[PDB]
Design a protein around this ligand. Structure first.
Ligand code: NA
Ligand code: ZN
Ligand code: ZN
Ligand code: ZN
Ligand code: ZN
Ligand code: ZN
Length: 355
């Protein structure tokens, strides 16, 4: 049984981690199912719905990756192009020796998790990339990195002659049928925007930063985010967007049991909880690891679990889907609670959905 299942997993988790609100959406047998808990705003008491806007943090990277793939499919660049081919200001830099695909998959050579301290203007960002010295040879190490995929999204949008935000809001989101998903939440929708809650229980929301839109800037609810997942299960429409989504299901290297694609990370299905936790642990996400290189990028197919974790100061999100079994789960919360718990919860739920 569906509702009691989700409730049984989710609600104890909300109490244990003091999660004020969570929106959950699952895909099964071709239908969306919504389960909503608690409040978007603990002081007003406004209840969470599938239309409540959450910061989804790095789940945004899957949309950025899709935009990037779309630009590639439309001929703005080839994934194997050197980065400086698409960044005149980077010619002569280390990015002469880095591909767009490496940049998208955090394997450029040791770009850090966050921009350094005062790399926080466009002009200082440009100087930063220009003067960057690789820690590792290109394509040998995976180090999860906002600068890395941030630059990828930025240059990809530029290859079509548009700012990232414009290409996302005027082309990609509308073509995916996502009309309630935002990089900047309009006044008209501000009523739906949840508050995040810090470790100290203060209401907070993410602020704009250098390449923040690209790396972790999407606000959306569970309904829209599930629609994006549905497009990843079977999109039939514009051939280009279909081809783009297909590119995000391509694997470029692996780290242990996890295969890195564009935005999505995936596992061989069926996958155990232990393997899913490991692939999403600090061991993989907060340090550089040598990769298992692929002879050529590989279409990963349907017998996979695809996922992405996402966090901001006040928000915690998780998404996972399994195309061959037609199941997916979206979990959006307004507290940045341990990824470990997100993963157990989702695994327990998906396990039941499969059955
Ligand atoms: Na069974
Ligand atoms: Zn239902
Ligand atoms: Zn500054
Ligand atoms: Zn630029
Ligand atoms: Zn629209
Ligand atoms: Zn696919």
């Amino acid at each position: 049984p569906l509702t009691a299942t989700v409730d049984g997993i989710i609600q104890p988790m909300l109490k244990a981690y003091r999660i004020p609100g969570m929106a959950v959406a699952v895909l099964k047998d071709g239908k969306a199912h919504y389960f909503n808990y608690g409040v978007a705003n603990r002081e007003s008491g406004q209840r969470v719905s599938e239309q409540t806007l959450f910061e989804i943090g790095s789940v945004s990277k899957t949309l950025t990756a899709t935009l990037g793939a779309y630009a590639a499919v439309k001929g703005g660049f080839e994934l194997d192009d050197k980065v400086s081919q698409h960044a005149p200001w980077l010619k002569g830099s280390a990015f002469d020796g880095v591909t767009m695909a490496e940049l998208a998959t955090y394997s450029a050579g040791g770009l850090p998790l966050q921009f350094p301290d005062e790399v926080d203007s466009n002009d200082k960002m440009q100087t930063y990339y220009r003067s960057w010295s690789p820690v590792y040879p290109a394509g040998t190490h995976r180090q999860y990195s906002n600068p890395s995929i941030g630059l990828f999204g930025h240059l990809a949008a530029n290859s079509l002659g548009q700012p990232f935000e414009q290409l996302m809001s005027q082309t990609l989101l509308p073509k995916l049928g996502l009309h309630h998903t935002y990089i900047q939440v309009p006044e008209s929708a501000m009523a739906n925007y949840a508050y995040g809650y810090s470790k100290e229980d203060k209401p907070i929301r993410a602020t704009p930063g250098v390449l923040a839109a690209e790396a972790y800037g999407i606000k959306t609810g569970s309904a829209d985010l599930l629609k994006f997942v549905e497009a990843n299960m079977g999109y039939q429409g514009d051939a280009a967007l279909k081809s783009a989504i297909a590119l995000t299901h391509t694997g470029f290297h692996s780290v242990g049991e996890m295969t890195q694609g564009l935005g999505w990370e995936s596992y061989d299905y069926p996958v155990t909880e232990q393997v899913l936790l490991a692939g999403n642990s600090p061991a993989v996400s907060f340090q550089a690891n040598p990769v298992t290189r692929f002879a050529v990028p590989k279409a990963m197919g349907e017998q996979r679990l695809y996922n992405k974790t996402g966090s901001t100061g006040g928000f915690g999100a998780y998404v996972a889907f399994v195309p061959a079994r037609g199941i997916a789960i979206v979990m959006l919360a307004n507290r940045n609670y341990p990824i470990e718990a997100r993963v157990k919860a989702a695994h327990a739920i998906l396990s039941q959905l499969a059955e």
